[PDB]
Amino acid sequence: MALNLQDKQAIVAEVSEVAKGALSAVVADSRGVTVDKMTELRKAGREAGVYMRVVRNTLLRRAVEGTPFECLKDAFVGPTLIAYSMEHPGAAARLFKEFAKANAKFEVKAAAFEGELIPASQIDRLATLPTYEEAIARLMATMKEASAGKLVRTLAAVRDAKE
């Protein structure tokens, strides 16, 4: 390895992945298999790539003393074991879901997804981001307005009104 120098290094880089970062996910990894790497790196073949890293650096004293890149509320985000997930290029969307549906398949605990940076706070996995470049959800979102929400109430009596 090395000393204080190797230390700072991993941080400034790992933490520039939080400064220049598109997104951030904190996932405790008890019982982490190599299949684990074989996943976020498989979901990197034909859907991601090297635009993502996830260095288990719960070195804390490291990854944390080294977020003077402005990462408050992360002392609370420093408990137990974690595997920092940081985005550089691409949207912040897809990356979150990957773990969301990984850990839910068992694939090691997800630290109840303690949440992370970008919005900046605590725990509560949302779905803002992943619904993007699927704007056909805004095609289906208009709900035909005048027509679909029509053929559902203005036209739902007959199929349920002759009682």
């Binding site: 035909k144 027509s147 053929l151 559902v152 007959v158 199929r159 002759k162």
Partner: peptide, 30 residues
């Protein structure tokens, strides 16, 4: 047209016609 017009027809317009009507519009789109 006046909203009140489509209603009076979509509500009145019999049912021997209506249940074969409002259902038909449910058999055309969506």
């Amino acid at each position: 047209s006046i909203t009140k017009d489509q209603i009076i027809e979509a509500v009145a317009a019999m049912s021997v016609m209506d249940v074969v009507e409002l259902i038909s519009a449910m058999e055309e789109k969506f």
